[PDB]
């Protein structure tokens, strides 16, 4: 076939998902993950009905701000302010080259965007956010992945996309993997 | 030239080394890092006189055994039992598929190889090993790397080796970068 195991994708030692899902592991401190955003945007819209796209923030980059940065991401999902906050965060760290030195500074990034302080403080330190970050980390450890960005299809298909022709072929590969179980 | 920036190698945002050094970031839990060993072996012997090869173990893989696994590696350098212990460790985790579940089990791996318990316990919990692991982590964070394996030349040249022809061309690239400052 056009997509062969060991060439276009690698099978992970994990139980396949009981439902179609495309997962992306990244970190706001990851440069190419920032460059990868436009491609991620198109891939979602290009996804077949029924499939869900899930972003997972890893905590190994950024030193002692890694874990906090993961909570911030988890906070964006909880507050549904993901569409505006993701680019704002990728931008303040890469383009502006002004990384949040601590929790209070990280918090300020949200406050400067209009997100209410009481809303942020409740979610940032909440159970939902805590449960989500743990889930982010566990999934990364269990998949045995060694870096980011990483796009896994149905929980066991690591897209070794370094061989795709155009963005068109890339979507064809992901779409192809979604049907395989 | 044969090796262009942004194609064969990427310049890192870090101060160049005051002396020729080839660094490899890896993890014993990293599969390709295991496959990469033979290539690492040849590259060292192929290195020009005066250059030093330094392995750096990262702690982000292996969950709560990551940090311990880094100390174990640092322990191998301290006890100069690196030549025998590196392959033994890559082998017990990958080929034998029997990962050390805890510190005592990790310790046992050494004890089963003839390394004296008193010697291991002194170094494993020693200042030298502690100073080395910290150094491993700091270097990884400062380089802004997003995965392993990763080969950096003179502290600021990330070998984007995914474009080299044969192993011969790879060595030519590394050797080429060592002269650049």
Swiss-Prot record, chains A, B:
Localization terms from the record: Periplasm
Disulfide cross-links: 30-33
UniProt keyword list: Disulfide bond, Periplasm, Redox-active center, Signal, Virulence
PROSITE patterns found in the cross-reference section: THIOREDOXIN_2
Broad class of where this protein is predominantly found: periplasm
A GO term, aspect molecular function: protein disulfide isomerase activity
GO biological process, one term: cellular response to antibiotic
Cellular-component GO terms for this entry: outer membrane-bounded periplasmic space
Domain Thioredoxin: from-to ranges: 1-179
Keyword Disulfide bond: yes
Function description: Involved in disulfide-bond formation. Required for the functional maturation of secreted virulence factors. Acts by transferring its disulfide bond to other proteins.
Annotated family: Belongs to the thioredoxin family. DsbA subfamily.
Annotated protein name in UniProt: Thiol:disulfide interchange protein DsbA
Species classification: Bacteria, Pseudomonadati, Pseudomonadota, Gammaproteobacteria, Vibrionales
